[PDB]
Symmetry: C2
Subunit: 292 residues, 2 copies
């Protein structure tokens, strides 16, 4: 199945929601040519031991989420920003890989190397533990009955799994040094930051990555909880997901001004990147194909 017949209307509805509840639009970070090459060279070095090449185009597709979904008004540490570019991208490769290619002995040291290059010692350990936890989770839940149970039971069980699985807990734990903002740092470290933003990131990603995922047998997508071929059921389900995003956004507005800017730029930036990037244009292309 596919959600293509709903693409135009659902995009309009997401956009209407953002226009009313978030208003401020995300802004894209411009890296210099030098900066982008440093990021790509670090990405290539980290995945090369796994034996698969990743094209410059595929790296630029992956990196766009970081470019669009941070909070430029508040950025203090551009070395931390580059780290998030690299770490996001290389864990994206692992997400797209056949688990036969997962080699922890070769990859975990590369993740440590990245963290120690860009962060102070304490932040490096926090970022590295979160990266290690994410790639371990992605690996251990391929073909797991736990994943089946959490993804097929209810939206609540599913989003609970996604706090880690989508990578948002990792994101917050590698991004707080960008801002050096004490309250944001605490919400990152308790994972309240990831929990506040999981549904807004996941409902958007799930809608636009559905066609790819169902074609690959991937079950981690909330729209598989409804019959997408039943337009009535799909619309009621979609509305319930919009309601979840709105409630989260309204509660995010209770956080301090800087933290809420970061959280909302993340959710909205992810929507802008997702709806423009080649990764989500088609189910199988040269930036999203399974790495085998």
């Amino acid at each position: 199945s596919s959600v293509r017949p709903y693409l135009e209307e659902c995009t309009r509805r997401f956009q209407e929601m953002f226009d009313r509840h978030v208003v401020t639009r995300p802004t894209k970070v411009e890296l210099t040519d030098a900066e982008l090459r440093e990021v790509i060279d670090d990405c290539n070095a980290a995945v090369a031991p796994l034996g698969k090449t990743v094209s410059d185009e595929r790296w630029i597709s992956y990196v766009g989420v970081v470019l669009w979904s941070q909070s430029p008004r508040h950025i203090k540490d551009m070395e931390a920003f580059k780290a998030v570019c690299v770490l996001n991208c290389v864990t994206f490769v692992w997400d797209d890989m056949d688990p036969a290619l997962h080699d922890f002995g070769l990859f975990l040291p590369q993740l440590r190397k990245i963290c120690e290059k860009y962060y102070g010692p304490e932040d490096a350990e926090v970022a590295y533990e979160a990266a290690r936890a994410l790639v371990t989770s992605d690996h251990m839940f391929r073909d797991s009955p736990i994943k089946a149970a959490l993804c097929t039971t209810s939206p609540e069980q599913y989003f609970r799994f996604r706090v880690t699985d989508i990578g948002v807990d990792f994101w917050m734990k590698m991004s707080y040094p960008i801002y050096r903002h004490p309250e944001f740092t605490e919400h990152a470290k308790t994972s309240l930051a990831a929990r506040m933003t999981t549904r807004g990131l996941t409902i958007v990603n799930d809608f636009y990555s559905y066609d790819r995922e169902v074609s690959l047998g991937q079950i981690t997508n909330c729209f598989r909880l409804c019959d997408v071929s039943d337009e009535t059921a799909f619309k009621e389900f979609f509305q319930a997901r919009l309601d979840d995003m709105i409630e989260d956004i309204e509660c995010i507005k209770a956080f301090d001004q800087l933290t809420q800017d970061v959280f909302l730029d993340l959710i909205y930036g992810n929507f802008v990147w997702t709806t423009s990037n080649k990764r989500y244009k088609t189910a199988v292309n040269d930036v999203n194909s399974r790495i085998q």
Copy 2:
């Protein structure tokens, strides 16, 4: 001055009937030797001494009973880690019960690190310490926060999201995995999936039995404040929805590997057994659960 007292007997029976149907295996209490209990209590007293308030042996024993009842003794391998959880649980319970004027991070964080370094190896000590630091910092920073109000009053979903950290269950998991030395459990503890799976089962039970105390102290972190407890129909509807939440989580817990699900279910059910037997939840204000207060004239010369 609202209360769930009229519902106490029926709601206890309904929780018990749920456990008898869905969990079955009863929790079992760990017996510590006298020396082990004294080691724990001595470490608890040392850790809280810098904060300046005496804690009786009776109060420590009240706090420690949750660890004695809600771990998984079939699977315990590291009793040093188990003693650490006893101590860490207890001393963070004191912090939970304290007025925030008593909260001295400069004095207390080193004592948390000392406990962790005594009982865990170097990596585990860092994980337990960071989780302890995160919890006590969260408890303090949310005492008067608009964020806590928003999350606690909006919906059950926002509320249980706050409680993953606030009830202390993420801390519990991150300090408890060394007890079991079980790879899968360790991973679920470190992603917090373990905490997320068990939050509702712990929090719904705790909230029902701690409501009367919490309302009397103006504490808003309780899901039963989302309903009008004086309206029997509204209360029973809300209570039923919370039981459904517990049952859905328990059924998905049973998809985890056998040892991990044993530990998660012993935590949820053990907490219920301790909560429904312990003096801490028998009345709203007593000498094991009273607010630990800073005296306004602590500095006065007539002391």
